[PDB]
Every structure is written in C-alpha cells, then in structure tokens.
Amino acid sequence: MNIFEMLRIDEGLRLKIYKDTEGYYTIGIGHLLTKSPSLNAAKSELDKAIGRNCNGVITKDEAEKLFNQDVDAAVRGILRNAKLKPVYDSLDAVRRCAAINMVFQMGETGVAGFTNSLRMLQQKRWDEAAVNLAKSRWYNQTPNRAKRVITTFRTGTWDAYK
Numbered sequence: 001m002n003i004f005e006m007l008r009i010d011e012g013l014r015l016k017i018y019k020d021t022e023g024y025y026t027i028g029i030g031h032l033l034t035k036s037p038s039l040n041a042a043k044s045e046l047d048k049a050i051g052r053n054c055n056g057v058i059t060k061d062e063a064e065k066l067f068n069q070d071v072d073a074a075v076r077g078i079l080r081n082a083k084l085k086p087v088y089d090s091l092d093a094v095r096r097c098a099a100i101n102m103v104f105q106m107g108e109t110g111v112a113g114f115t116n117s118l119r120m121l122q123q124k125r126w127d128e129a130a131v132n133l134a135k136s137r138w139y140n141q142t143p144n145r146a147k148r149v150i151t152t153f154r155t156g157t158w159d160a161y162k
C-alpha cells in the first residue's frame with residue numbers, strides 16, 4: 001500500500017464528469033473541477049486541465065496523470081505550509097499517507113480548525129488524536145472514509161484498507 005492505492009480506494013475512478021459528496025463537479029480519481037453550479041464551467045476547467053476538447057469525458061491514462069499531479073500538489077502544499085510541515089515531518093510513512101489523504105480531500109483552508117489534532121499527532125498521542133479528528137464536519141459527512149483515515153493515524157498500519 002502507498003498513497004496512490006489508498007486514495008484510489010477512497011476516491012474510485014470515473015471517466016465522465018460526476019458530482020462529489022458535496023455536489024461539486026469532479027472527474028477521474030476525485031479531481032475537483034469547479035464549485036460552480038455550471039456544467040459548462042466544469043467542462044472548461046476539464047479541457048484546460050487535459051489540454052484538449054474533452055466533452056466531459058477522459059481516458060484512464062488522463063485520469064491517472066491528473067491524479068499524480070493532484071497527489072504531488074497535496075504533498076508540496078504540506079511542505080510549504082508552516083503549520084503542516086513540522087507535523088508531517090514528525091510522522092512515519094504510513095501516517096504521512098493519512099495526512100496527504102486529508103489534504104487531498106480538504107485542501108488547506110481549514111488547517112487552523114485542526115490545530116489541536118495536529119498537536120496531538122505531533123505528540124504521538126494517537127488515541128487522543130483519533131478522538132479529536134472525529135469531532136469534525138469531515139467525519140460526520142464522510143464517516144466511512146474518515147474512519148479509515150483515522151484508523152491509519154491511530155495504528156500506523158494499513159489495516160483499514162486491507
């Protein structure tokens with residue numbers, strides 16, 4: 001298991017524009033296109049991302065390329081973030097995957113709400129961090145995925161994905 005396999009499980013693969021759990025236009029392996037309600041706006045974003053006129057449909061190769069770019073962007077965002085980088089660097093490799101998973105799903109705009117969770121993770125207080133992480137809109141709205149990510153932080157194993 002690695003971050004790509006983990007997120008492929010959590011996000012699935014769809015080759016035509018779909019809506020994510022929040023109702024936003026998405027494609028591929030969880031690639032957000034736009035928060036606008038306009039399907040045309042989503043189609044423009046798709047064509048820009050792929051570099052051709054797609055008509056809302058991509059190939060598996062294209063979905064996997066977008067996915068690699070999106071995982072890399074999440075990692076680089078962590079490494080550029082003064083609050084996230086020290087916590088990330090304190091983690092083992094399996095727990096780093098859980099961190100990337102969260103940033104892939106939620107970005108960085110809500111990092112400050114996770115200040116206490118981040119402190120508990122850096123302190124390696126795994127059970128306490130798991131309890132704190134579940135006190136979130138994230139957990140309530142996507143509980144099965146959040147439970148898998150939280151179990152990964154709690155145990156440092158891939159047990160939730162096996």
Ligand SMILES: c1ccc(CCSc2cnn[nH]2)cc1
Nearest residue numbers: 084087088099102106107114
């Ligand atoms: C290290 C780095 C990141 C994380 C999850 C990020 S805390 C957050 C970021 N964006 N939304 N919530 C955990 C340990």
